[PDB]
Structure formats: C-alpha cells, structure tokens
Ligand binder design. Structure first.
Ligand SMILES: C[C@H]1C[C@@H]2[C@@H](C[C@]1(O)CC(=O)O)C(C)(C)CCC2(C)C
Length: 133
C-alpha cells in the first residue's frame, strides 16, 4: 500500500519554468521545443514491490519499472543514459538521475487532488501539475 495515492492515470495540466529546467539538464533546442509542448499522461501502477511509471505523449512513450531504493539504468526520453534511484521520503517519491558527473532530482507528491512534480537541476526548479485523467 506504499504508493496507493499515486497509482492511477494522470494528465498534465500546468507547467512552469520547464524550458529553463531542460536547458540546465542539457537538452538541445529542438527536443526542448517538442518535449516542452508534450502533454503527457503519466500512468503509475504497483505490483508487489515493483512500481511502474509510464509517460505517454505525442513526443515519446516511455516506461520504467523499479523497486524503491534499488538503482537501475534508465534511458530518458531525451536520450540520456542515467543511473536512477527512486525512494519514498516522507510520502514523496524522489527520483535521482546521475550521468556525466551531473545530477537531477524529480519529486512527485500528492497535494489535494493533484500530483505535483518538482524538477530540479542545480538552482533551477520547474513545477508541473497533473490531475486525474
Ligand atoms: C523530469 C521531466 C523530464 C522530461 C519528461 C517530463 C519529466 O519526467 C517531468 C514530468 O513527468 O512531467 C518529458 C517532457 C515527458 C520528456 C523529456 C524529459 C526531459 C525526459
């Protein structure tokens, strides 16, 4: 019952500061424009100890599965090859990606009826809000 309140299908409703986040990550111009335009559906499910997160959009359809605290290799939608670890910290899903000596942290939390996604790369944060689909 670890992630019950995250499970379901969620649709993007707002984004702020996201182009600047992606710049900080090192995403190139054309990918920033098309990815920034994406309006993903995020599908979160749990089966035993395995969490699956899918992001479906006109840009890319991506899927990760993982166990909390257990690192994995991830290919991001912008083609970074990263080492990822996802944990639950005080009810917040915390996703850290490491690559090329860089690090970004993506936090997902339930707030009211929303799923709020905070994306941080150095001093740049972007806040994205999802609603139930
Ligand atoms: C951290 C951020 C990364 C970002 C994806 C979105 C997202 O995961 C945040 C979110 O879930 O809304 C996106 C736009 C679907 C594809 C391109 C990236 C760079 C991999």
């Amino acid at each position: 019952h670890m992630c019950d309140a995250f499970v379901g299908t969620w649709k993007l409703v707002s984004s702020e500061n996201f182009d600047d986040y992606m710049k900080e990550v090192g995403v190139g111009f054309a990918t920033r424009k098309v990815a920034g335009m994406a309006k993903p559906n995020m599908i979160i499910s749990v089966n035993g100890d395995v969490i699956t997160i899918k992001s479906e959009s006109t840009f890319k359809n991506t899927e990760i599965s993982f166990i909390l605290g257990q690192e994995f290799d991830e290919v991001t939608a912008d083609d970074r090859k990263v080492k990822s670890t996802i944990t639950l910290d005080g009810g917040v899903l915390v996703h850290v990606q490491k690559w090329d000596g860089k690090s970004t942290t993506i936090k997902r939390k339930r707030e009211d009826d929303k799923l709020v996604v905070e994306c941080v790369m150095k001093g740049v944060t972007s806040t994205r809000v999802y609603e139930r689909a």
